[PDB]
Amino acid sequence: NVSLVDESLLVGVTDEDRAVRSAHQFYERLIGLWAPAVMEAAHELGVFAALAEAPADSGELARRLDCDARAMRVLLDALYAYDVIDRIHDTNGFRYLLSAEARECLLPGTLFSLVGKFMHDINVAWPAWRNLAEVVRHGARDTSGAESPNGIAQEDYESLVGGINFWAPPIVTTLSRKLRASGRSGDATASVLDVGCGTGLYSQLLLREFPRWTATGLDVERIATLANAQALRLGVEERFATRAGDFWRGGWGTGYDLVLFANIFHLQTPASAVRLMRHAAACLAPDGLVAVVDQIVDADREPKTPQDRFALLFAASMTNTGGGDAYTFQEYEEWFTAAGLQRIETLDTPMHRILLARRAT
């Protein structure tokens, strides 16, 4: 399906055979470089927007985009080989197009658009990844020698946050099922705090699921603007508010039934993480919950499941961009304890775990 090596043709177990087999497997990993390069170049050239507007043969698309015809065929067939675009082959030749699901992912301004991820890679991640050895040499450390938090800046998040909206629906449906099995129902009011809310999608999907709930997102000015616009598109604006500014300044509020941290703790240092956890505990209502949605692994750091394997890789993505980590269950439990909280649930999602915690006293 995805394989680039016909492994059925790598046979034997002599030392030579095993070395050759490993070399092919390592080469296949190395050529994983090619997929973001192809996809991100296609984005830069306007390929996806053009295919959505009108399906096209490769020569026609090259003319429309002022590109070389042969190179465009090569690029389009590579995108088809990655299952990113569709292609019809009949007696008239080839026509390239987007499926509805691909359109949602590849065009700007849709709910699940990956354009912000493409742009994050182009502008931030790809130059950093080429310098990874330097950061490993020197450490993700500040001028005083202390661990630094992750370095992705608010202006970079303006793109990236929309590009990670796709994570939210599986996470929110898993969380919502558990909250309903926890006696939290529709028709009862509750207040949510979404710390570092990004576009606000996690909050906004909760608002759709729980029609009497309200939610408040904390994020920086320009991100809060994005989040309010998205709430309006989703029809939950009357129950979604933002509180713009650096969340380290406080002004979070109190009485929250749910405090959500999605994709926040991996940005922290241990010192900043424990502070955030204590802040969260202080704003909880009686019977409130903290939900951490993150790349979380056991201290053994064994890649036993896809979520564990992704967490170990995500830690490298954090180091690449200046700090943070994929923290361990044991670390979260330490932070919970320090904040007077106790972990009560762990739920798996496609690429994350949800940890739920509540006040012990």
Ligand X SMILES: Nc1ncnc2c1ncn2[C@@H]1O[C@H](CSCC[C@H](N)C(=O)O)[C@@H](O)[C@H]1O
Residues binding ligand X (CB under 6 A) = 154, 157, 161, 164, 196-198, 218-220, 223, 246-248, 262-264
Give the sign of the dihedral formed by CA 142, CA 148, CA 154, CA 157: positive
- β-pair type (353-359, 341-348): antiparallel
Q: Is residue 141 a contact partner of residue 147, using CB atoms and an 8 Å limit?
A: yes
Q: Is residue 226 a contact partner of residue 240, using CB atoms and an 8 Å limit?
A: no
C-beta of 161 vs 258, nearer to ligand X: 161
Count CA within 13 A, CB hemisphere, residue 344: 16
Give alpha helix (H) positions in 82-144: 100-106, 115-120, 126-129, 132-138
Joined tokens for residue 237? 């604006």
Residues 254, 243: Cα–Cα separation, whole Å: 13
Task: Verify binding: residue 143, a second copy, rule CB under 8 A.
Answer: no
Task: Verify binding: residue 329, a second copy, rule CB under 8 A.
Answer: no
Q: Is 257 annotated as a binding residue?
A: no
Please pick, from the candidates 49, 69, 220, 344, the single residue that binds a second copy as defined by CB under 8 A. Answer: 69
* Contact partner, 146, from ligand X, a second copy, none, Cβ < 5-8 Å per class: none
* Contact partner, 248, from a second copy, ligand X, none, Cβ < 5-8 Å per class: ligand X
C-beta of 42 vs 231, nearer to ligand X: 231
Torsion of CA 23, 24, 26, 31, to 10 degrees: 140
Q: Is residue 355 a contact partner of residue 343, using CB atoms and an 8 Å limit?
A: yes
Locate tokens 């923290």: which residue? 327
In the chain, at which residue ranges do the beta strands (DSSP E only) sit?
86-90, 93-97, 191-195, 214-219, 240-244, 256-262, 284-294, 341-348, 353-359
* Contact partner, 24, from ligand X, a second copy, none, Cβ < 5-8 Å per class: a second copy
* Contact partner, 346, from a second copy, ligand X, none, Cβ < 5-8 Å per class: none
Task: Verify binding: residue 154, a second copy, rule CB under 8 A.
Answer: no
For residue 336, give Cα distances in angstroms to 166, 225, 236, 313, 344: 28, 32, 31, 25, 11
Task: Verify binding: residue 335, a second copy, rule CB under 8 A.
Answer: no
C-beta of 220 vs 344, nearer to ligand X: 220
Please pick, from the candidates 49, 55, 60, 80, the single residue that binds a second copy as defined by CB under 8 A. Answer: 80
Task: Verify binding: residue 306, a second copy, rule CB under 8 A.
Answer: yes
For residue 103, give Cα distances in angstroms to 48, 83, 113, 207: 8, 13, 8, 26
Task: Verify binding: residue 166, a second copy, rule CB under 8 A.
Answer: yes
Q: Is 246 annotated as a binding residue?
A: yes
Residues 241, 356: Cα–Cα separation, whole Å: 23
C-beta of 40 vs 194, nearer to a second copy: 40
Task: Verify binding: residue 97, a second copy, rule CB under 8 A.
Answer: no
Would you give the binding string for a second copy spanning residues 168-197, x where CB under 8 A is met? -xx---x-----------------------
Task: Verify binding: residue 309, a second copy, rule CB under 8 A.
Answer: yes
Q: How far is the CB of 229 from a second copy (least distance, A)?
A: 19
Please pick, from the candidates 35, 220, 241, 338, the single residue that binds a second copy as defined by CB under 8 A. Answer: 35
Task: Verify binding: residue 270, a second copy, rule CB under 8 A.
Answer: no
Closest CA to 307 of 297, 299, 317, 319: 297
C-beta of 57 vs 121, nearer to ligand X: 121
Task: Verify binding: residue 108, a second copy, rule CB under 8 A.
Answer: no
Q: How far is the CB of 30 from a second copy (least distance, A)?
A: 5
Please pick, from the candidates 54, 81, 153, 188, the single residue that binds a second copy as defined by CB under 8 A. Answer: 81
* Contact partner, 357, from a second copy, ligand X, none, Cβ < 5-8 Å per class: none
Give phi and psi for 353, each to the nearest 5: -120, 150
Which residue numbers belong to the known binding site for S-adenosyl-L-homocysteine?
A: 219, 246-247, 263
